[PDB]
Design a protein around this ligand. Sequence first.
Ligand SMILES: Nc1ncnc2c1ncn2[C@@H]1O[C@H](COP(=O)(O)CP(=O)(O)OP(=O)(O)O)[C@@H](O)[C@H]1O
Ligand SMILES: [Mg+2]
Ligand SMILES: [Zn+2]
Ligand SMILES: [Zn+2]
Ligand SMILES: [Zn+2]
Lengths: 171, 107, 557, 271, 97, 84, 178, 112
Amino acid sequence: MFFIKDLSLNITLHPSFFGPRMKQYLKTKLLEEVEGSCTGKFGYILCVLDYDNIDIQRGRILPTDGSAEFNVKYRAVVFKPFKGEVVDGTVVSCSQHGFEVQVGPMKVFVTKHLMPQDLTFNAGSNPPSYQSSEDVITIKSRIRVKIEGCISQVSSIHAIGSIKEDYLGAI
Amino acid sequence: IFVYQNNITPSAMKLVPSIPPATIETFNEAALVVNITHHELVPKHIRLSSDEKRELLKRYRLKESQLPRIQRADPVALYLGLKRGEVVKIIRKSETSGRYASYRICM
Amino acid sequence: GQQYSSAPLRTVKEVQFGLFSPEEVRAISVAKIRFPETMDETQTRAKIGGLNDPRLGSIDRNLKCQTCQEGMNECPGHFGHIDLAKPVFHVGFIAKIKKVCECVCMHCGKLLLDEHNELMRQALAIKDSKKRFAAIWTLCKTKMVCETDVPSEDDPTQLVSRGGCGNTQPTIRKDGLKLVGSWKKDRATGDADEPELRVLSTEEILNIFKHISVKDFTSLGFNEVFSRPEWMILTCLPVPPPPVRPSISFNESQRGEDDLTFKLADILKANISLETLEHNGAPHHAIEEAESLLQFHVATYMDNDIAGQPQALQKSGRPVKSIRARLKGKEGRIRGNLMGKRVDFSARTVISGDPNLELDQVGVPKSIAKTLTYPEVVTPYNIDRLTQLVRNGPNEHPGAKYVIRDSGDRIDLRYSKRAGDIQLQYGWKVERHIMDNDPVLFNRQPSLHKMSMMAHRVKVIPYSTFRLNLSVTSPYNADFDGDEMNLHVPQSEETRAELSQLCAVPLQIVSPQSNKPCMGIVQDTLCGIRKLTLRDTFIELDQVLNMLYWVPDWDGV
Amino acid sequence: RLVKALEDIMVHYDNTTRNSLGNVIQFIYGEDGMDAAHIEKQSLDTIGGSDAAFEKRYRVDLLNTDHTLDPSLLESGSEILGDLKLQVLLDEEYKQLVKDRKFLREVFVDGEANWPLPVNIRRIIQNAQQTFHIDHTKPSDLTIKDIVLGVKDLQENLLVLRGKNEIIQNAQRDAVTLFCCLLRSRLATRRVLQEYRLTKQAFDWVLSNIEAQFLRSVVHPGEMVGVLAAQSIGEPATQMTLNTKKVTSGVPRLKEILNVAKNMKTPSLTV
Amino acid sequence: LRFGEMERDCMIAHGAASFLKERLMEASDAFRVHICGICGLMTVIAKLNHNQFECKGCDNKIDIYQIHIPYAAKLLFQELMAMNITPRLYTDRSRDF
Amino acid sequence: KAIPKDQRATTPYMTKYERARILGTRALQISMNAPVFVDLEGETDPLRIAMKELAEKKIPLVIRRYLPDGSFEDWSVEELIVDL
Amino acid sequence: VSTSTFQTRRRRLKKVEEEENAATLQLGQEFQLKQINHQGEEEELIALNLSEARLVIKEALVERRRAFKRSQKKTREKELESIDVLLEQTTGGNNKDLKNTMQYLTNFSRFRDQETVGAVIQLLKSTGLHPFEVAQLGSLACDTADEAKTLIPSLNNKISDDELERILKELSNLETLY
Amino acid sequence: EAGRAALYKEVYNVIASDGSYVNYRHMALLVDVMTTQGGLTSVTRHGFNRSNTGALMRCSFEETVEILFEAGASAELDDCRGVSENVILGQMAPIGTGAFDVMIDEESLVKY
DNA sequence: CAAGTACTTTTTCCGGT
RNA sequence: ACCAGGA
DNA sequence: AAGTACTTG
Ligand SMILES: Nc1ncnc2c1ncn2[C@@H]1O[C@H](COP(=O)(O)CP(=O)(O)OP(=O)(O)O)[C@@H](O)[C@H]1O
Ligand SMILES: [Mg+2]
Ligand SMILES: [Zn+2]
Ligand SMILES: [Zn+2]
Ligand SMILES: [Zn+2]
């Protein structure tokens, strides 16, 4: 995945900023509002591309107030995960319920029951782990999880994933 | 054009649209005694070509709706044998400009 | 004011009319609306989970809304619903409901005529939905039989089957809120003499309507998304929130319920009877009795000024105020609350003419200036002026009433402990008194003119009247026999410009109504001009010098 | 009713008169594209009088020893006599002035000369006379070409409609038709030289002023002429009441009119 | 003071578009409703504090606007809805012309 | 579809309404502490500052003239003739 | 106020179906193959492989520093420390999302240099596979065509096992070291 | 065309009966409005208010509810081009000052 | 094809029982 | 709300 | 009430 999606955003500047550092304050305001943000629709809007050529266009002056509205058009690198998406990630936390794995900007969590049977939760370790007949999944471990489904929420997207199927698991 | 003295039976009147692309016009002789077009209040109405009409509409950025309308049944529309959708250019004298050009689309 | 919402602010570009589908009513609804009892949880002052706030709006101004948290001035009321025990005709639509019945087959829901008929295909051709439905109805009314097979688009010998159903169509007539048909009959070729006379049930019509084809109703006036014909028959009734029907709540433990709140409770009461009646041992006539009762209340809630006499008057003899009548013109929503409004920054007094005022000015009493305010934003150019106006306060003439911080809050210079200690920052508004030379809209009703409302220059003066130049009398049609005039103060630089630049008195001098000036020299000045401009009239040096000094633009020559 | 009927009508940026549907009511506002405020009851001289008197006014014949402009009217006068090329210009001038006379006489059948029109030409001339201290004795620094051609050019600059195509450019001519009829009658060669007695500079200023004054005189796109008309018809009807053949007259007849009353009170013919 | 129809009519004759707006809005009525982008009604259960928006019956927790209309218009609309008519308000346009 | 500058066909002069709206807008911005593009030659009023800015044609505003069909002509204040 | 697109769809009243997203290559309405760039042109969807991705963000942020210091006029773990430093200059910091992503990319990138990523992009962008498959094939380390056809089920009938295996062999070759 | 000329003649004859004068154009507009649609559209609820303008607009004169009721039943879509609709919507109408839009051009802003 | 019904509105703004 | 008034 | 538009005989 990790797409490049062309997008726009309406910004309402106040008359006080109608100085020649116009494009500047707008491009900056755009970067504040959009970068690091996360919606469900486009996912994680991570990094705005081609600052030098960010299109301001003309801004219409809103009638009974002074402020002007510009539809800033722009291109950005986004991250929307999907169900069926297979992702290589690093483990973060690990409870008796399962292990949450950091995959880019988002965390995919694996249920104890979404893991192969042989993998058993070992409480007695610093830090807590999952022990197989020959394998060990703990805090710093690298994994490959299949995303079973997502939950688009607030300023994030979290998801449940499996390591049950073939070619999935620790690396 | 079929000029009739007194009447045409609702019987014979059924044959009127029977032979297209050719068209038929029923005219009561008694109406034609005086030419209406010649009157004080009747300005030069002019039939437009499909090209002239295409131009009128293009030049004023109009939909056929937006244009003033001449009734199909209209005495001048009849005299000219206006067909639904045909535009007429009306040239009238103005106390304001001297000469004002108007347009009416058929109905 | 009203709080900040992160929602993008836009304008209404299009208004898409339609009809509430019963499923939408039940979806949008935040409560159902089971009890005719207003509130008082068994006398215990608070709302009942039945009528007015079973999640709805909010009665108590000191109580936040149950659905949205916001409360009173922020919270638009939230809708509810009542599932009607039996479907009912929507008063407004009884008209169309009949004409639609008159157009369709009362058994299969097929259009009585179709593309096979030449006059029909012609009317089906009409582009306008209203004119098309008009031309359809006039043709389809007369077709008293749903045709099984119609003569084909060639010979009458070999006829092609269109839609089925042989069935005779009723001769529908309205019996006030009721629709009753008279099916032709066939009996031994002739008969009628004496046909089948029966009332068409709401539910039977509903079902026939349901079966009208998407192509068919779209050929009729209708649209498959926003207005299906089935949506003219009310199944689920939307319950307007308190804001629509406010309880004019006098004292503490004392009611004041709105007309609509009672009218709904009637509908509720009328329904619960009809409901329990059919769930119980249905006496089948006591059923069509309690049904017709509910059909009436649901009719008389929306419209009470119905043709068929019963005026559904409140027990006081006073007729119930229908929603229809709230919206009906000149005094009433559209014409009275929206096309015109009662407004703030408006002032009115007795007018009197002054020869010592300039044409474009308007004598304004000090009281009126100390009252009327202009919101001026703290800028470096006015920072010091404004701090003095603020210092002067609400009572000195060149003073101010309020100080508005960026912090959204209003300071009352009249009570604030900091009314002296006040230190203005750029970007704050100061609600100052009207000052000399401020542009104001001045007007005299009737107002048959562009000219009857002109922008003037303020001139604060003593004595309780509006003073105006005598020449400016003519456009307003004012005299000083006890006439009063209104003043409106603009609230922003944007609108001050509008007044000064477009509607100032000097601009209005030459009238387009008649291509001539609509202001001249009148009365004392006109009578005295003739007298002075005579060949007999001569002025001695003494007077002649004052005569000169009096012209403020005099060359000194 | 008059307001509610017209409200939505205004002048859009193409001088068109349209309602909320963009439906064309008038092609050009009030048939001329002018603002009612910038119009005065000016007189179209050309209209009436004897055909004989019209000749005496507008006719200049450099080919006749008597009918030429006397060299007291202009410096050229002496060297102008019998110029065949120049007399062609004066022949166009007079032939166009005659065309005008006939045209006006069709438009205003009764010969009513006084018609409200933009730009007060009379006043502009008067002002040139007191501005330039026009000595009614000394001959002018004007050529026939200075006048004849000058007016021809001034007309090309009296812009109502702007579009670069036949339809609009014809609509432009049509909109300006009667104003020029006036302009030509008032600015004819003999009239300028013998009556007004203008210098080249004076005349040059009279032209620019007519032009500027003309351009101001046009309607402004945005003007709500719907409500304007409604009130301009309406207000007089209200003072036809509020203040102090026998055909249905006044207020009830206006009622009859708007209502399009079929069964009218005093129906009549004028045979 | 009543700024009546006649009074509105002069303001329109003048072409004082903003001054008219001001009178009818800031100087009188003016309210802020939250409208849905799907079914153009005042359906939004806006908890503008928690920034929660929602129009259940549309499951729309996203495509929501805010408009400034005279409080009497907010009324009209609710009164028309109470009478079964949907006066759907949209911020985009489809038609053209 | 937005008419191109070389095909513009409206008045080259600034309509009474345009004038008033620009003056009002500028005055609304100047008053809202916007940057003044002229030399305040001792001016305290934002409308007078707007007039001053307009006379020197140093107003950064563009009038979008909508035609009845929807299309528009963009005109700068700097280019519009001010006969008013 | 939130972010708008270029996908216009006039959804009047008609709410839902919104048919679930998968590896039936049924991504969003937004993440359609026939997507449309703002300059009017209809351009095919852009999916990046972790590294094809890393190189974009790096480049964009580097060019940003250039423009930020234009207005201000008037080895893997060593690549990671330097990135956190470039970010410290061009980003908002509050954007932990990008720092988190930058570390992820830096760690899990399969191809170090633009020269390499160029050749990778060429190889896969010839298979006629859908933008997503191409990206997944670039960022997921598979050996058997089965590993690939199992992890990228969308491929299942779209390519020869042998042909896919040829690609996989040539990806293993381009694969830069650590 | 003759009906229009007669109509003006007749309207003008009433205004001029009182003695008073009204510039042509005004009367010409009323006359032209009653004309355009094909025949004689009356200045009554059966005339202009029956034409295909805005639903909210028409409703604001004479048949208020009846109008909004049929608007509902036939799923009418209001353009919102009429003065009336904007007043009802509390928005700046496209009248004079509202007949255009205002924009800041950055390039000219940085130029000054 | 005619008489008879069901329809709709009628200027603006500004103290008391 | 009706009644009474004012221009 | 007055006028019309619209059905109904
Ligand atoms: N009922 C009413 N409705 C509307 N306007 C009215 C009105 N009564 C009075 N007016 C206004 O006031 C004027 C009438 O004033 P009146 O008090 O009747 C004395 P008059 O006999 O008209 O003498 P005058 O106008 O020479 O001073 C009208 O021209 C009108 O604008
Ligand atoms: Mg008086
Ligand atoms: Zn609430
Ligand atoms: Zn049938
Ligand atoms: Zn919704």
